[PDB]
Design a protein that fits this description.
Layout: H1 5-8, E1 15-19, H2 20-25, H3 33-36, E2 42-45, E3 58-61, E4 69-73, E5 76-77, E6 106-113, E7 127-133, E8 141-151, E9 159-169, E10 174-185, E11 214-229, E12 232-246, H4 258-263, E13 269-284, E14 287-303, E15 322-340, E16 346-360, E17 386-403, E18 406-417, E19 421-433, E20 438-449, E21 461-464, E22 476-479, E23 487-500, E24 503-520, E25 526-527, E26 539-563, E27 566-580, E28 593-601, E29 607-616, E30 642-654, E31 657-664, E32 697-705
Parallel strand pairs: 4-7, 22-26
Antiparallel strand pairs: 1-6, 2-3, 4-5, 6-7, 8-9, 8-32, 9-10, 10-11, 11-12, 12-13, 13-14, 14-15, 15-16, 16-17, 17-18, 18-19, 19-20, 20-23, 21-22, 23-24, 24-26, 25-26, 26-27, 27-28, 28-29, 29-30, 30-31, 31-32
C-alpha cells in the first residue's frame, strides 16, 4: 500500500531529517537552531536585512528569510514570535521560535525546504521545521539529561541545561508522557564588542553594539493518550514555557541611555507560551484519519520603548515599566487518507484546517499624528490595540504509483483569508528510478504566506522625520494596509542522487519565484495634513507588495563509508541569487556558500568520536539605504570566508548511562558585531558585520535513561 503524499514527499531533495542520535552526538547549547542550521540549504540569519536585532539569529531556509520558516511541534504550528512588534525593516526584537522544546526530549526534526513544504500552507514559503517529541512506548521509560558548556573567552555566555522525561502506560487503555526542563544561556558581556564597533562620534561616542542576549527557560509538558477502541485514540496535551532574557544592551540603532545601562544583566523581556491540544486518531476499514485542535496563548511582557524620536527602539526613560502583548492562536485540522487500488495504486488525502489569530498589542499602535499631520480614516490617539485574522483551508493530495520506481504526487490547497481573500496553492512532486541506484526527483509548487497582523492593520502606524523615508528627505508615515495581497512563491527543485551501500552522492538545483513579498512602501500614496514645522504634511507610505523577487542555488551531498566503523558526510550549499527585483537589493544576507563536513568514527561498541568542519563563504550587505541611495563607507563592509571546526565523543558506560564531551570552534575563530548595516547620526554602519560568532567552547553532557 502506497504511502500518503505527506509521507512520500519527505523523500524530496529538499528534505533533511535530524535524529535524536544526531542531536546527542552534536548537542546544542540550548536553542535547537544550533543543529538545525547545519542542514543543507539552511542558514542562521538575522530577521532583517537592516541588521537591526542582528544577534538574534534564526533559521532561514534557502535565503528566504526567517519570517518564511514555519516552525511546527509534532505537526502543530508555533506562532509565538508574532506577539513581538514587526518593524519598518521587518525587524523583530525576538529570539525566534526554535527554543520552546528541550533538545534531549526531541525524537527527530524534519527540515522541509522548497516545493515539498508548500502543502503546509500559510507561512511555508521558505520551508518547514517540524520538531517531533519523543512519545510513550509499551513499557515505562524515562530519562534525565544534563548539559553544560565552558567558553574559552569569559565575555561569551555559557549555557547550562537539565531536562527529564517520563512516559509509559498508566492503565490498560491509558498512557502518559511528560517532560520538563530548566536552562540558562548567559548573555555575552556588555563590552564584548568594544574594540570592534563601527566609528561613533559626538553624542554617540562610547556606544556599543551588544553581543548575544541571554535566556532562562522553564518548560513542562504533559500528554495523556487514551485508547477508546482498537480503531480510536484520543490525546490530550498541555505545555507551559517561560523564557526570560538577560539583557546586554541591545537597542535598535545601537545607542544607549541610562535606562539601558541600568538594565544590563537583568530581565527586560519575558515570554510565556501556553499550549493546549486535543487530537483524535482513527484506524478504519477504508484507511485512516487525523483531527486536532490546538490553542496557543503567548504573552510577551517587556519594557516600554518608543516608535520614533529619541526613544525609537530603546527603553523609554519617561515611561518606565513593562507592557504585555497577547497572542491567541487557535488551529483546527482534519483529514482522511484513502488507499485506492483500481487504475494506479494510489493514496488520496483529503483535509481541511481553520486558524484564527488574535493579537492584542498596546504599544504598537500608539504613534500619534501631532508632528507629521493627521491622516483621514486614522484616529491620532487611543486606537484599538487588537487585530485578528482567520484562514479556512481545503486540500486534496494524491500519491500515485505509475510503475514501480515512479511516483507522482499532485496536490491542491485552497485558503480563504477573511480579509485578504482566496488563495490557490497547486503542488506537484515526483520521484523516478533511473537505475537501481540512481533517482531523479523534482518538484514545483506555489507556497502561500498571508500578511502578518502588523502589516495588515490600518491602525499600525510608524513615523519618521526624514531618515527612514524612501525617495525623499522630509517626514513620513508608514501605515498598515488591509487590502494587501498574500505573498506567494513558486518554488521548484530538480535533484539527482546516487545511492548504494550507504554511499550517497547527490545534487539539487532550486529556485523560488517569490511574488508580492510585503515590504515598506517606496512611493507615497497620499499626504497627511497639518503638523508642526517643516515636517508638517508628511508623506503617507503603505506596507506594499513587491512584484518579484528570486532566490536560486544548489545543494549537494556526499557521504562516503571510508571503512566499517567510519563515515564521512558532507553537504554543500551554494547561493546563486537572492534579489529583490524592484529595489535591485539583496533579499536575505546569507553566506555565499556553506560546506558542512563530518567525520564519524565508531571507535568501539561503547565509544564514538566525531570531527566536524564548516566553511562559510563571503557575506555582502544591502547596497542601498532607506532612501534608496547607494550606501558608502563602512556600510559596504563584507565578511570574509571562514571555517569553524569541532571535536566530540560519546562514551556509553552502560545501557543506562552515557556521557558526551567535546569542543566547538576549536581554532577559536571569532567575529564581533560592529553595528547595523547602515548608520544613523553619529554611528557608522557596519555592513555585513552584524553578529557575534562565539569562540572556542568546551562542553560536557550526561544522559541517564531506562
Amino acid at each position: 500500500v502506497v504511502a500518503t503524499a505527506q509521507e512520500e514527499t519527505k523523500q524530496a531533495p529538499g528534505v533533511s531529517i535530524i535524529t535524536a542520535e544526531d542531536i546527542a552526538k552534536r548537542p546544542p547549547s540550548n536553542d535547537l537552531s544550533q543543529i538545525i542550521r547545519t542542514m543543507p540549504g539552511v542558514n542562521l540569519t538575522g530577521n532583517s536585512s537592516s541588521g537591526q536585532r542582528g544577534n538574534n539569529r534564526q533559521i532561514d531556509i534557502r535565503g528566504m528569510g526567517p519570517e518564511n520558516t514555519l516552525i511546527l511541534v509534532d505537526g502543530k504550528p508555533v506562532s509565538s514570535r508574532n506577539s513581538v512588534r514587526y518593524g519598518w525593516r521587518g525587524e523583530r526584537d525576538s529570539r525566534g521560535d526554535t527554543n520552546w522544546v528541550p533538545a534531549d526530549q526531541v525524537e527527530r526534526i524534519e527540515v522541509i525546504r522548497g516545493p515539498a513544504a508548500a502543502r503546509y500552507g500559510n507561512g511555508a514559503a521558505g520551508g518547514v521545521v517540524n520538531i517531533i517529541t519523543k512519545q510513550a512506548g509499551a513499557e515505562t521509560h524515562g530519562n534525565l539529561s544534563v548539559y553544560s558548556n565552558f567558553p574559552q573567552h569569559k565575555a561569551e555566555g555559557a549555557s547550562e541545561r537539565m531536562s527529564f522525561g517520563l512516559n509509559g502506560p498508566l492503565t490498560e487503555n491509558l498512557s502518559y508522557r511528560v517532560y520538563g526542563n530548566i536552562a540558562k544561556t548567559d548573555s555575552d558581556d556588555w563590552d564584548i564588542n568594544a574594540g570592534h564597533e563601527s566609528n561613533r562620534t559626538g553624542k554617540q561616542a562610547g556606544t556599543l553594539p551588544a553581543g548575544r542576549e541571554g535566556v532562562r527557560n522553564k518548560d513542562i509538558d504533559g500528554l495523556l493518550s487514551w485508547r477508546l477502541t482498537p480503531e480510536q485514540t484520543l490525546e490530550f496535551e498541555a505545555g507551559f514555557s517561560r523564557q526570560g532574557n538577560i539583557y546586554t544592551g541591545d537597542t535598535q540603532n545601537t545607542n544607549s541611555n541610562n535606562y539601558v545601562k541600568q538594565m544590563l544583566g537583568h530581565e527586560t523581556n519575558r515570554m510565556y507560551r501556553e499550549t493546549y491540544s486535543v487530537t483524535h486518531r482513527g484506524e478504519w476499514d477504508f484507511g485512516s484519519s487525523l483531527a486536532y485542535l490546538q490553542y496557543e496563548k503567548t504573552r510577551n511582557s517587556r519594557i516600554n520603548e518608543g516608535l520614533a524620536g529619541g526613544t525609537e527602539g530603546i527603553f523609554d526613560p519617561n515611561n518606565a515599566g513593562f507592557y504585555t502583548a497577547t497572542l491567541r492562536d487557535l488551529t483546527a485540522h482534519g483529514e482522511v487518507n484513502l488507499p485506492l487500488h483500481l487504475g494506479y495504486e494510489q493514496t488520496l488525502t483529503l483535509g481541511s484546517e481553520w486558524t484564527e489569530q488574535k493579537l492584542d498589542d498596546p504599544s504598537s499602535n500608539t504613534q500619534n499624528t501631532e508632528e507629521g499631520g493627521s491622516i483621514p480614516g486614522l484616529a491620532g490617539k487611543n486606537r484599538s490595540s487588537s487585530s485578528s485574522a482567520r484562514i479556512f483551508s481545503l486540500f486534496a493530495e494524491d500519491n500515485i504509483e505509475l510503475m514501480p520506481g515512479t511516483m507522482l504526487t499532485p496536490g491542491l490547497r485552497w485558503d480563504h483569508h477573511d480579509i485578504v481573500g482566496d488563495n490557490w496553492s497547486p503542488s506537484l512532486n515526483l520521484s523516478h528510478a533511473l537505475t537501481e541506484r540512481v533517482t531523479l526527483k523534482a518538484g514545483i509548487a506555489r507556497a502561500y504566506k498571508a500578511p502578518n497582523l502588523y502589516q495588515l492593520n490600518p491602525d499600525y502606524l510608524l513615523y519618521s522625520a526624514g531618515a527612514g523615508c524612501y525617495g525623499q528627505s522630509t517626514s513620513c508615515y508608514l501605515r498598515g494596509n488591509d487590502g494587501l495581497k498574500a505573498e506567494t512563491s513558486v518554488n521548484k527543485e530538480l535533484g539527482i542522487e546516487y545511492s548504494h551501500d550507504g554511499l550517497v552522492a547527490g545534487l539539487t538545483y532550486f529556485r523560488n519565484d517569490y511574488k508580492n513579498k510585503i515590504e515598506s512602501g517606496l512611493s507615497p500614496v497620499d499626504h497627511a495634513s497639518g503638523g508642526k514645522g517643516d515636517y508638517a504634511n508628511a508623506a503617507i507610505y503603505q506596507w506594499e507588495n513587491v512584484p518579484k523577487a528570486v532566490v536560486e542555488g544548489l545543494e549537494g551531498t556526499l557521504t562516503l563509508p571510508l571503512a566499517d566503523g567510519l563515515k564521512w558526510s558532507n553537504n554543500l550549499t551554494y547561493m546563486l541569487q537572492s534579489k529583490n527585483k524592484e529595489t535591485g537589493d539583496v533579499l536575505s544576507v546569507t553566506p555565499r556558500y556553506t560546506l558542512n563536513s563530518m567525520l564519524d568514527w565508531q571507535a568501539t561498541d561503547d565509544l564514538s568520536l566525531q570531527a566536524t568542519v564548516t566553511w562559510y563563504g563571503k557575506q555582502k550587505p544591502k547596497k542601498y539605504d532607506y532612501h534608496g541611495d547607494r550606501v558608502t563607507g563602512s556600510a559596504n563592509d563584507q565578511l570574509s570566508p571562514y571555517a569553524i571546526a569541532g571535536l566530540g565523543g560519546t562514551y556509553r558506560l552502560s545501557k543506562n548511562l552515557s556521557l558526551g564531551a567535546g569542543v566547538d570552534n576549536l581554532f577559536d575563530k571569532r567575529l564581533f558585531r560592529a553595528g547595523n548595516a547602515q548608520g544613523v547620526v553619529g554611528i557608522d554602519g557596519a555592513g555585513a558585520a552584524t553578529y557575534n560568532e562565539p569562540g572556542r567552547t568546551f562542553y560536557t553532557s550526561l544522559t541517564a535513561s531506562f
